[PDB]
């Protein structure tokens, strides 16, 4: 199917506690292979996946070199964005940045992106055409005009359509055993008495990859969207994911209910039922 590479940059000012914290993470689809914590010992870009570990000195040197530059860019920004909003130099604030690229089945460029947030809100971001910007407010327009002037978008388009997809394609090869896999959910249902007329029938999906999954409950075919408790898809810690969905069933009606699982890695969707 299709694939994506994304980098996540978080910069947090710490007035009275030295320089801002800077963390960076890299993903291909739902797997990470890069990472960097300004606070760590190495002061290096480090590997977080087995298939990236033997890239070489050049790669590691290149990435480390650039990530340090990213960190410095964000140090400046935190100061600039204080003034923009006439903020007191006491408060700790956050800058977030995400960008990456997608390819399709044919592994050709599909779409690129690049957004930016101050204190948890859309600040400024590149549009789908990769030629223009969309500012969230008054402050951000100034930034818009700056980057428009400096032809910044044109360079992001070049990276996104080139280096970005190029290395995504290279990693998909490097880690083809990890990244080109389809771990089908292993599924089952649990039943637990709440009272003397109510039971707990929560469905389970375990050890699947990628994260994208759909768990739904039904009564007599009817969807119980509003009556289902659904958890966020969660990391197993081993590179797989988990999710469950529970409904309450007036004891005696269990057979009215079915759970439905849809995932890339299943031939067909599953129709469980506490028959």
């Amino acid at each position: 199917g299709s694939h994506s590479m994304r980098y996540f940059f978080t910069s947090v000012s710490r007035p009275g506690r030295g320089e801002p914290r800077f963390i960076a993470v890299g993903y291909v689809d739902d797997t990470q292979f890069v990472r960097f914590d300004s606070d760590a010992a190495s002061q290096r870009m480090e590997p977080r996946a087995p298939w990236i570990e033997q890239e070489g000195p050049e790669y590691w040197d290149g990435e480390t070199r650039k990530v340090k530059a990213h960190s410095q860019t964000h140090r400046v920004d935190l100061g600039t964005l204080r003034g923009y909003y006439n903020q007191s130099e006491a408060g700790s604030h956050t800058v977030q940045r995400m960008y990456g690229c997608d390819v399709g089945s044919d592994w050709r460029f599909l779409r690129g992106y690049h957004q930016y947030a101050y204190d948890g809100k859309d600040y400024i971001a590149l549009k789908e055409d990769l030629r223009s910007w969309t500012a969230a407010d008054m402050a951000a327009q100034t930034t818009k005009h700056k980057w428009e002037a400096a032809h910044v978008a044109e360079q992001l388009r070049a990276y996104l359509e080139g280096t970005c997809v190029e290395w995504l394609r290279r990693y998909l090869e490097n880690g083809k055993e990890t990244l080109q896999r389809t771990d089908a959910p292993k599924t089952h249902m649990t039943h637990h008495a709440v009272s003397d007329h109510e039971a707990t029938l929560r469905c389970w999906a375990l050890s699947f990859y990628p994260a994208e999954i759909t768990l739904t409950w039904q009564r007599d075919g009817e969807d119980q969207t509003q009556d289902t408790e659904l958890v966020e898809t969660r990391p197993a810690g081993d590179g797989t994911f988990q999710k469950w969905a529970a409904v309450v069933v007036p004891s005696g009606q269990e057979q009215r209910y079915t759970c439905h699982v849809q995932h890339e890695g299943l031939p067909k969707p599953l129709t469980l039922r506490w028959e």
Partner: peptide, 5 residues
Amino acid sequence: KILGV
């Protein structure tokens, strides 16, 4: 590889 207000 990463990009080289």
